[PDB]
């Protein structure tokens, strides 16, 4: 099933803040599912090597939340450059889905896409221009059928890996309870 | 009914191309709906003043399509500035939904957002950070229930209200046929 036109690239980034103009990427994880949301593969996980003054002067939210998740320390200890993570990610994703076919999948994935466009345009090129944004459906559920949100489970932050598994599980809940089979 | 929390702000833009690094906005159109997708208001439509330096040197797709469309000439005839379009759009929108409540709605509305974020920062501030991307559901339809696309009405009209009302209507189809409400 490695090359199916309908497979999906799921990803989550962690950043030093919200604005691509000043902020940089700290973490990347990728999961490939088939079109039915079965998990076909996990990409490597990269904490991105960043200097201490970058890590120390990020967003208050980020100091707290990345400090808590253990990401900050993992970037202190990493030798991984963004340049390397971009090559590996692109090669992995190429191994699984044809160029141009899969939209970018995840929660508020357009935010991530801003960072990928600016900092990893080679990687972005493998994707379709479309976004599969799980938060779109959450917003429709909030207004159309909010009790569905009760079945949605949100665990605590560790890896970007975990945040992706949450997005998939969330969409899986919607498929079962919110969309018509 | 004015200023209700679940009211939804819809928009489409037309541009000189795909890369807002140095591409610009040709047209702005905005529709408000309640949470049921009932159209509550049409917003000021704005073709944006661009010199022939800009209009002559758009992409091939844009020269040919914005030419038959009538928009290129409208931007040449147009007196309204970027700031005036920003100031007005913000005002209209401010009437109909409280601040931070509404995601930004439309097809691939993240692309639009990149242009709104750079050239109209004040306007984007009124939205929730979330996107409501109908094309997310179109991507799911294609994979889960393609028969549903048959009822979607895609003319191919690349204008202002043209493509908006088509995004709103496309969501209405999904609501009847694709969602379990």
Numbering used by the authors:
A (entry chain A), B (entry chain C): 1 to 181
Please share excerpts from the published article on this structure.
In the two linked uridine (U-U)-bound structure, sufficient electron density was observed for only two uridine molecules, although five linked uridine (5′-U(-3)-U(-2)-U(-1)-U(1)-U(2)-3′) was used for crystallisation. Even though a partial electron density of the third uridine was observed, the intensity of electron density was significantly weak. This means that CpsORN tightly grabs only the last two nucleotides of the 5-mer RNA. Meanwhile, the rest of the 5-mer RNA are located outside the binding pocket, in a flexible state. For this RNA-bound structure determination, D163A inactive mutant CpsORN protein was used, as mentioned in the pNP-TMP-bound structure. The last two ribonucleotides make hydrophobic stacking interactions with Leu18, Trp61, and Tyr129 residues. A more detailed examination revealed that the indole ring of Trp61 forms a hydrophobic interaction with the base of nucleotide U2, forming a barrier at the end of the bound RNA substrate. The side chain of Leu18 is located between the bases of nucleotides U1 and U2 of the bound substrate. The phenyl ring of Tyr129 forms a hydrophobic interaction with the base of nucleotide U1. All these interacting residues act as a wedge that may allow CpsORN to cleave the exact position of RNA substrate and guide the 3′-terminal exo-RNA cutting.
